[PDB]
Design a protein around this motif. Structure first.
Motif, mmCIF file in Angstrom:
data_model
loop_
_atom_site.group_PDB
_atom_site.id
_atom_site.type_symbol
_atom_site.label_atom_id
_atom_site.label_comp_id
_atom_site.label_asym_id
_atom_site.label_seq_id
_atom_site.Cartn_x
_atom_site.Cartn_y
_atom_site.Cartn_z
ATOM 1 N N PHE A 16 0.801 -1.197 0.000
ATOM 2 C CA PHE A 16 0.000 0.000 0.000
ATOM 3 C C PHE A 16 0.840 1.255 0.000
ATOM 4 N N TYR A 72 1.806 1.768 -3.616
ATOM 5 C CA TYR A 72 0.649 2.222 -4.370
ATOM 6 C C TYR A 72 0.403 3.722 -4.115
ATOM 7 N N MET A 73 0.384 4.131 -2.837
ATOM 8 C CA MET A 73 0.197 5.514 -2.516
ATOM 9 C C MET A 73 1.296 6.389 -3.142
ATOM 10 N N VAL A 90 0.963 10.448 -3.171
ATOM 11 C CA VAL A 90 0.749 10.803 -1.785
ATOM 12 C C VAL A 90 2.072 11.097 -1.097
ATOM 13 N N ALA A 116 -1.665 7.155 7.112
ATOM 14 C CA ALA A 116 -2.738 6.422 6.452
ATOM 15 C C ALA A 116 -2.413 4.955 6.372
ATOM 16 N N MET A 162 -14.962 -0.087 7.214
ATOM 17 C CA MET A 162 -15.658 0.268 5.977
ATOM 18 C C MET A 162 -17.120 -0.153 6.156
ATOM 19 N N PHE A 222 -7.129 7.935 11.135
ATOM 20 C CA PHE A 222 -6.546 8.794 10.110
ATOM 21 C C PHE A 222 -7.580 9.788 9.607
ATOM 22 N N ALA A 239 -9.381 10.679 0.683
ATOM 23 C CA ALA A 239 -8.814 10.744 2.067
ATOM 24 C C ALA A 239 -7.451 11.446 2.044
ATOM 25 N N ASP A 240 -6.691 11.343 0.948
ATOM 26 C CA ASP A 240 -5.424 12.011 0.737
ATOM 27 C C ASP A 240 -5.586 13.398 0.073
ATOM 28 N N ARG A 284 -7.053 14.549 -2.699
ATOM 29 C CA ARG A 284 -7.180 14.764 -4.123
ATOM 30 C C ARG A 284 -8.639 15.114 -4.449
ATOM 31 N N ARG A 299 -13.512 -3.676 -5.438
ATOM 32 C CA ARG A 299 -13.999 -4.354 -4.250
ATOM 33 C C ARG A 299 -14.701 -5.640 -4.684
ATOM 34 N N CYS A 344 -6.202 -2.033 -5.354
ATOM 35 C CA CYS A 344 -5.943 -0.671 -5.811
ATOM 36 C C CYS A 344 -4.837 -0.707 -6.839
ATOM 37 N N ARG A 352 -5.828 -5.009 -0.061
ATOM 38 C CA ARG A 352 -6.287 -4.775 1.297
ATOM 39 C C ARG A 352 -7.450 -5.736 1.560
ATOM 40 N N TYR A 393 -10.434 -7.179 4.044
ATOM 41 C CA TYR A 393 -11.375 -6.840 5.113
ATOM 42 C C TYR A 393 -12.146 -8.072 5.545
HETATM 43 C C1 LIG Z 1 -5.089 7.436 2.100
HETATM 44 N N1 LIG Z 1 -5.683 6.506 1.127
HETATM 45 C C2 LIG Z 1 -6.766 5.610 1.324
HETATM 46 C C3 LIG Z 1 -7.246 5.371 2.718
HETATM 47 C C4 LIG Z 1 -6.435 4.750 3.657
HETATM 48 C C5 LIG Z 1 -6.819 4.629 4.975
HETATM 49 C C6 LIG Z 1 -8.050 5.127 5.375
HETATM 50 C C7 LIG Z 1 -8.862 5.763 4.449
HETATM 51 C C8 LIG Z 1 -8.484 5.927 3.133
HETATM 52 C C9 LIG Z 1 -7.133 5.059 0.092
HETATM 53 C C10 LIG Z 1 -8.146 4.011 -0.211
HETATM 54 C C11 LIG Z 1 -9.514 4.124 0.451
HETATM 55 C C12 LIG Z 1 -10.467 3.079 -0.160
HETATM 56 C C13 LIG Z 1 -10.005 1.680 0.115
HETATM 57 C C14 LIG Z 1 -10.131 1.267 1.559
HETATM 58 O O1 LIG Z 1 -11.227 1.691 2.166
HETATM 59 O O2 LIG Z 1 -9.336 0.475 2.094
HETATM 60 C C15 LIG Z 1 -8.587 1.504 -0.366
HETATM 61 C C16 LIG Z 1 -7.641 2.604 0.080
HETATM 62 C C17 LIG Z 1 -6.275 5.643 -0.911
HETATM 63 C C18 LIG Z 1 -6.162 5.498 -2.298
HETATM 64 C C19 LIG Z 1 -5.227 6.290 -2.993
HETATM 65 C C20 LIG Z 1 -4.383 7.165 -2.262
HETATM 66 C C21 LIG Z 1 -4.424 7.300 -0.894
HETATM 67 C C22 LIG Z 1 -5.399 6.543 -0.231
#
Ligand SMILES: Cn1c(-c2ccccc2)c([C@H]2CC[C@@H](C(=O)O)CC2)c2ccccc21
Length: 134
Positions: A19, A22-23, A28, A36, A43, A60, A78-79, A81, A109, A120, A129, A131
């Motif tokens: 992750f 990916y970020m 990010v 994060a 969720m 976060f 959440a970041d 954008r 999902r 992602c 990720r 759940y």
């Molecule tokens: C910060 N952050 C989060 C995130 C990370 C932690 C808490 C909230 C948003 C996501 C997604 C949110 C949807 C999904 C998920 O719900 O897991 C996958 C990651 C995400 C996607 C791209 C960039 C930053 C990102």
């Protein structure tokens, strides 16, 4: 219409792989990535008629989106954008595409066994990720 019945509920993050990378690919910044990446969100997916709501609650950030399948909406992620988002159901998978600044990322999902699996993808970088029911 029984749309998205297998997704509805409250889910808690159990694992997160690749992750940070990916970020990074998304763009990010360091401090957001670290905090994060540590989050263990809940969720919450619900459906009321044609409207699907997805909430994410964690230390976060708390986020909420509501949408109709196939119908674009403007999202602040959440970041932080500012993206144009479209969420569709393709072969039983919820497919969320975000577009911003000539860039795109896709978040899928999927229901697999008793889990909800989130994939992602940004260019060649994928993160998974997983759940479980809360
Ligand atoms: C910060 N952050 C989060 C995130 C990370 C932690 C808490 C909230 C948003 C996501 C997604 C949110 C949807 C999904 C998920 O719900 O897991 C996958 C990651 C995400 C996607 C791209 C960039 C930053 C990102």
């Amino acid at each position: 219409s029984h749309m998205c019945d297998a997704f509805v509920g409250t889910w808690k993050l159990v694992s997160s792989e690749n992750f940070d990378d990916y970020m990074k690919e998304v763009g990010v910044g360091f401090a957001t990535r670290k905090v994060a990446g540590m989050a263990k969100p809940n969720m919450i997916i619900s459906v009321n008629g044609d409207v699907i709501t997805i909430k994410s609650e964690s230390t976060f950030k708390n986020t909420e989106i509501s949408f109709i399948l196939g119908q674009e909406f403007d999202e602040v992620t959440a970041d932080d954008r500012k993206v144009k988002s479209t969420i569709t159901l393709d072969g039983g998978v919820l497919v969320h595409v975000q577009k911003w600044d000539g860039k795109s990322t896709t978040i899928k999902r999927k229901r697999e066994d008793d889990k909800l699996v989130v994939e992602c993808v940004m260019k060649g970088v994928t993160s998974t990720r997983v759940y479980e029911r809360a």
